[PDB]
Design a protein around this ligand. Structure first.
Ligand SMILES: NC(=O)c1ccc[n+]([C@@H]2O[C@H](COP(=O)([O-])OP(=O)(O)OC[C@H]3O[C@@H](n4cnc5c(N)ncnc54)[C@H](OP(=O)(O)O)[C@@H]3O)[C@@H](O)[C@H]2O)c1
Ligand SMILES: NC(=O)c1ccc[n+]([C@@H]2O[C@H](COP(=O)([O-])OP(=O)(O)OC[C@H]3O[C@@H](n4cnc5c(N)ncnc54)[C@H](OP(=O)(O)O)[C@@H]3O)[C@@H](O)[C@H]2O)c1
Ligand SMILES: NC(=O)c1ccc[n+]([C@@H]2O[C@H](COP(=O)([O-])OP(=O)(O)OC[C@H]3O[C@@H](n4cnc5c(N)ncnc54)[C@H](OP(=O)(O)O)[C@@H]3O)[C@@H](O)[C@H]2O)c1
Ligand SMILES: NC(=O)c1ccc[n+]([C@@H]2O[C@H](COP(=O)([O-])OP(=O)(O)OC[C@H]3O[C@@H](n4cnc5c(N)ncnc54)[C@H](OP(=O)(O)O)[C@@H]3O)[C@@H](O)[C@H]2O)c1
Ligand SMILES: NC(=O)c1ccc[n+]([C@@H]2O[C@H](COP(=O)([O-])OP(=O)(O)OC[C@H]3O[C@@H](n4cnc5c(N)ncnc54)[C@H](OP(=O)(O)O)[C@@H]3O)[C@@H](O)[C@H]2O)c1
Ligand SMILES: NC(=O)c1ccc[n+]([C@@H]2O[C@H](COP(=O)([O-])OP(=O)(O)OC[C@H]3O[C@@H](n4cnc5c(N)ncnc54)[C@H](OP(=O)(O)O)[C@@H]3O)[C@@H](O)[C@H]2O)c1
Lengths: 270, 270, 270, 270, 270, 270
């Protein structure tokens, strides 16, 4: 990060911001926020009042606007997506345009600009997808994986990261926004080209959650078979029973309540 | 089919040909075979020696070549795909270009030409896909489904059909090529706009198959929940445990051998 | 508005929302909100809880996504723009892509769908522009004006509306958001094809404004020459000293304070 | 100009030719004339009978034809435009395609080919534009200015030049074609990346002109504020009362007549 | 021609003008001149001073600019081409873009606008072509011919016209500009969809020509075989020894001199 | 061929395969087969069972799929075409898309990837073409020839090869598939940039052929004039009576029968 330039596509999102407040008071050269929305960008600019933040208008659908932003960049965190389920169900083609083709553009541009590392953000919904958001995401995973095979890593390294949700008796994964940034920083440092990184996470029942108030699949069977264990993460390396919310360290109110406390968002009656 | 024109995209395939030998000696006006390959087209033309067969060079990636072929058509059987697994795994983007965007083009063109019915051919691999072929297919299903919502049916009716394979102890579905045409003819007649039709099929263990020589999922849990039963077919209608090869009428050698006999292909030592 | 369908491109904006809360409890058939951002769209959907609101994902840069949304629409309020000054100064091409070409797409699509009336929202900055936002806006005005000449009005009527800002001794125009909707409703009813409508508005000095706390050009000289007076609006009809903030009814604290009161936004210490 | 290659887009114009007869008997390597019209190109080729002149068919709307011409070029004088007022008023989009997007293509191609300097020819009409020609030109100025910020100058230097007209009591600027080439040669040598250069020019009243037979704005107020004085030129450098024809050295018949004499065009009754 | 609208693409050319001075003092509704060059268009506009002449900026490479011009047109004379030999030899792709794809655009647009008749101007060089101009022209002939098969004539009729040159012992065809317009008017009236019309023309030796100062192939062998004779024209109708300058009525000085006289161009020492 | 990579576009064809069985048991690094059809590719893969064979899905119409395949390639044999006559006659535009534009893409991509040599396969039908296949081929020849002028050879060398047919009294050329590979290997080694190579070949009468069972033009007059003789080949170098089947070594049954024998295809009653 000594004089290094980071580009975050979809930089104005929940995640882009979390990577920001993290990376900012650091000694990285420049953090390029790249997205469509001048309003969110304007809100970010004013508050942080920090010169390392560069704002780029553009969208991942358009190769020429990606290139401009991509010039002389070292690391890309590709977070730009259509990520809501109904919006993708009614407009699957838009899901395609952004999630899949948007990713081809980011990758081609990255390679052309001799970017060192690209990390594509993905979702547990891509593991056995049933909805268009998840499906398009699965397809984005295959896309970056195929690209990684063809590209020498010392030129450009290309990897991805699935996560479940951040921030009645059935179960769901528990990740904070702080936890999400971690997975990516982890991928940055340790991923080899083609890898999908997934964070090991506690997974509360949705019923026991609502009490602390005063099944999600992260790896397909086949992915768990092929994978590699890194401690708090599995690593699915590119080729050439299952990891889900019902079978990690499941928690009860006693623990559900504690993790909540740390969300600087939830602890708000001040 | 009185003076009706049928267009088959990917008309030169295993299926296109099966629909052909079926529909030909009929009284349909014209059967438009639309595909990329002049060689296969040439082989078809010579043999059948039948005036109702019209050959169109074009590909589904290209809207202008679709339109030409689409002019004054009544029914489309959309069979054009990249359907092999490794080829889609190494070239997912091509899978996207053909399977998903190819389908947007066919649909837009169909609608513009006031086509009456479009049937998109799909695959059991689209149900909980893990591979890019299947994934892109799943995405194609969402695409035609989304399009069907926005389009009045009396303008253009849009439906699809999944099938397993045609022609060690684990199980797999058994459909002939004759069985495959049936499913489509069925969809033609009875599908409402947005439907996915799936044929009920016997499903032998792969081990007991190889003996007659002298798990596949067709519906996701959620799809089986929502579906409607038509006898030899389920119907999944558009919104706004599972049906698989391990739990249909499973067969043993006695029955496996008999079905084989009818394949005009297998019974060949003449 | 009896069974009439309205489409608002950039429907998620300050203005789109103002037109919404206005048109909603009415008897219009359907109000299509068309924009890029699923998050804003999601926030709107939840709150209003109103069936006439239809949400369309798409962007004006893309003709195919415009068409989908444009199907069977009667009236379009074209509000989609890159409207901040610095963002347009650093990324003029994006300004071009959205403000000018976005507008060609909306117009072509409108015409093709036999839309009855399209209203393009514009800005005082388009009158003698010096910045890229204003310049691109000026260009958008010429674009819709040129299109209006070529199109019979009984097919599709095409007009636009400039306004100054809504919501030290130099002067600036004073329009509320309520005032802005008015101008558009006015254009809807009374504009002929090609017209630019501009609202007559009081124009306080920025110095006397900040006191009530307890030059903008709307028409170029040449435009004032050619224009037509409608009472609270000027009408600039298509061809084949100046109207500015220093010379309307200028106001002092006594009046500045009163208009403020009505902004349901400013009167907030509750 | 020792073995240097110059490309003139719109090379067949009034200006392209003036730069030609100037640069020709020099020792520059090659002067590439790039334009759409084979007829004008053919007329030029025949007459000059000079090997340094290379003729390229292409147009600035098309990136692939720009690249071909752009290969191994050192300096570009970008003169290709739709420059007549009514033609731009009726066909603003064409104005956009050529003047603005044509310029993005030329710039991108220039950069890719590691061109040393690009000079975009502009017009006084871009200063407070009211017409589409002027507006599109203003937009072209912002476009090249934005591009210059993002590009290191030692890679590719990007600048522009406004001029009034060349060759009843109100006033207008007086530049010859010889004067116009000068401004560009000046920009070539002295412009820094992002600069707009404007020539200081005498400005006769149109009434006193017609007698020698035997208001134009070059800088907006704001541009005059920010500018830098170079003697016979102002320099407007890129960010991060007015200069007009009514207030330069205005001339009377005595001087109007003399300047005329030098136009090798006007002195023609031979 | 009662209230009929004619569009001439490449309307600013030698031919466009000849069709103009012909059709003008008539009672046709509107003659749309469509081309790239505002300068030629401006020169035409001023001189003829005639309201039936409408000037359209656009180029045939661009479908959207064709459509605008094509709206409500009855007859198209497609004369837009890259027609010089060396320019096509060095830039064959441009030849392709204009001559072949330009023609696909004109045809598609014509059909969409329910144009009654389109006439594509072609050249003797398309008969056994050896150069890129001729080759691209040959290809344009096949293109319009293929399109004519697929299109019902009562919708849109599509035909073409080859001619040799207008205005040492080897031979060449002799057509005036007046003769060229004739061939087209002839095609307009009598061509069936798919026809190539060729004018029968006297063909002087180039040696005997230069004396009156005080081999070209129009039909390939195969084309002469298939053709139909109409008096002063052959008609080559669409499928599903040779006609050349060495064997028409060849002329000697006595006749060469006389035909010359009529060229209002040659008889100029006044 | 020491660690050299060969790409064959249209690699699945009659020719692609002939170049394969030739080059395979060699010591070349990698032979990239690039084409549209996964089925043919799959058939090739299985049989040869040889690691040097790499299979790429893509088509020449699409630049992005060409680039992927083109990365780090040393030699390209461009064999991808629409080569049947009727298919090109009915769909000339497809002929254009593949044969001409497909070739521009392959060339641009080749150059960008710093490919050493590209050989475009052509046909005797391009010499005085009368059909769209031949015409489009002629145009492809001009296209690669034009490109070769603009490109330094030490960067990328670009050449082509015409051949007649491989494998009543009128005559036709006789080349085997083995003969066809030869011509290309010859071009590989000896062609200079811009050359068209043509093989000297015996040319039997079609009547005397059918007896051994127990006019084609390769160079236009003008091409024979300009050409250079290399023994068993003519070489047509780029600029800045005829060679045909009726006048090579014509053969009678005695020789016709013998050449046949060697076709490992014809000698099949085993
Ligand atoms: N619950 C979760 O947070 C969660 C769970 C699993 C996976 N993920 C994955 O993590 C990634 C980012 O998540 P998030 O929490 O940051 O979502 P988010 O807050 O909605 O951020 C997405 C950002 O993408 C931008 N964007 C959308 N389309 C774009 C385009 N075409 N070009 C450029 N930018 C575009 C949007 O900015 P503009 O509107 O300004 O363009 C938005 O700020 C997603 O890909 C998602 O699949 C998230
Ligand atoms: N085992 C099975 O047969 C099976 C099982 C499940 C589902 N399905 C589904 O049924 C459909 C058709 O199956 P099939 O047995 O006919 O496969 P197939 O025999 O490979 O037929 C596919 C045809 O599509 C054509 N095609 C490919 N890309 C095209 C493009 N871009 N434009 C136009 N045509 C194109 C090909 O013809 P050209 O090469 O001539 O263009 C080919 O003949 C597929 O979508 C598949 O997913 C099949
Ligand atoms: N101060 C003012 O309010 C003011 C003054 C003068 C003139 N105007 C004019 O009035 C118009 C609208 O003003 P506003 O107050 O509503 O601004 P706004 O609140 O920023 O609304 C603009 C909307 O456009 C949408 N949008 C942007 N790019 C788009 C694209 N490519 N496709 C589809 N939608 C897109 C955005 O939604 P998504 O991000 O969801 O796509 C945004 O909600 C503007 O054109 C402006 O020039 C406004
Ligand atoms: N009165 C003046 O002369 C004056 C005053 C102020 C500013 N300027 C500026 O100076 C510049 C050039 O002026 P000028 O006097 O040379 O005008 P001009 O004589 O009309 O020259 C413009 C040239 O541009 C070429 N062109 C147009 N569109 C093109 C395209 N898409 N691709 C490639 N070439 C194209 C035309 O050549 P083809 O038709 O052969 O393509 C034409 O020869 C203009 O940008 C103008 O704004 C001129
Ligand atoms: N000697 C002859 O005259 C002769 C002989 C045989 C055949 N022909 C055929 O007759 C046709 C016309 O001949 P002509 O004598 O009129 O040639 P011309 O005088 O050069 O006319 C061609 C016109 O086409 C226009 N043009 C070129 N590219 C264009 C584009 N992309 N979009 C729109 N317009 C375009 C040009 O106008 P702008 O520059 O204003 O766009 C030009 O005025 C040609 O197709 C030619 O093959 C002519
Ligand atoms: N009789 C002859 O053999 C003969 C005579 C004279 C000249 N030639 C020339 O030699 C060349 C090759 O001849 P051939 O005998 O190999 O013909 P072929 O056997 O038909 O081979 C052509 C190959 O091109 C591929 N192809 C077609 N369109 C493509 C596209 N858009 N992208 C990528 N690949 C594409 C096809 O593969 P997919 O279907 O898998 O894409 C096909 O295997 C041709 O250009 C032809 O003009 C041949």
């Amino acid at each position: 990060f000594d004089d290094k330039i980071l580009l975050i596509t979809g930089g104005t999102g929940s995640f882009g911001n979390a990577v920001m407040k993290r990376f900012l008071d650091s000694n990285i050269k420049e953090i390029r926020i790249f997205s469509r929305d001048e309003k969110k960008q304007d809100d970010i600019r004013k508050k942080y009042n920090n010169s390392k933040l560069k704002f780029y208008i553009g969208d991942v659908r358009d190769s020429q606007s990606v290139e401009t932003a991509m010039r002389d960049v070292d690391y890309v965190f590709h977070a730009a997506a259509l990520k809501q389920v109904p919006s993708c169900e009614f407009f699957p083609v838009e899901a395609v345009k952004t999630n899949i083709i948007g990713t081809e553009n980011v990758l081609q541009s990255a390679i052309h600009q001799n970017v060192k590392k690209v990390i594509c953000l993905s979702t547990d919904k891509a593991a056995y997808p049933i909805n268009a958001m998840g499906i398009s995401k699965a397809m984005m995973e295959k896309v970056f994986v195929a690209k990684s095979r063809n590209i020498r890593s010392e030129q450009t390294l290309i990897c991805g990261t699935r996560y479940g949700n951040v921030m009645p008796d059935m179960t769901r994964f528990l990740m904070s926004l702080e936890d999400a940034v971690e997975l990516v920083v982890h991928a940055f440092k340790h991923a080899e080209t083609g890898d999908i990184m997934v964070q090991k996470a506690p997974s509360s029942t949705v019923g026991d959650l609502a009490t602390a108030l005063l099944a999600e699949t992260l790896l397909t069977r086949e992915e768990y078979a092929q994978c590699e264990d890194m401690g708090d993460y599995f690593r699915v390396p590119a080729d050439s029973y299952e990891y889900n919310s019902d079978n990690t360290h499941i928690l009860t109110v006693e623990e559900i309540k504690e993790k909540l406390l740390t969300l600087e968002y939830v602890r708000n009656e001040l």
